[PDB]
Amino acid sequence: XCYXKTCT
Ligand SMILES: *C(=O)C(CNCCN)CNCCN
């Protein structure tokens, strides 16, 4: 998930 550039 890139939800806040978190790109997990
Ligand atoms: C979120 O985008 C992640 C994939 N990592 C980013 C680059 N491939 C997939 N979903 C989160 C992990 N379960």
Cβ density class 1-8: b for 16+ within 10 Å, e for less: eeeeeeee
Q: Which two tokens stand for residue 4?
A: 């806040």
**Distance between CA atoms of residues 1 and 8, nearest Å:** 5
Q: Which two tokens stand for residue 7?
A: 């790109």
**Distance between CA atoms of residues 3 and 8, nearest Å:** 9
> Look-up: residue for tokens 């998930």?
1
Q: Please indicate the experimental technique that yielded this structure.
A: NMR
**Distance between CA atoms of residues 8 and 5, nearest Å:** 9
- Residue of minimum CA distance from atom 8 in ligand 1: 7
| Contacts (Cβ under 8 Å, ≥6 apart) of 1 | 7, 8
What's the 1 CA to ligand 1 centre distance in angstroms?
A: 4
What's the 6 CA to ligand 1 centre distance in angstroms?
A: 9
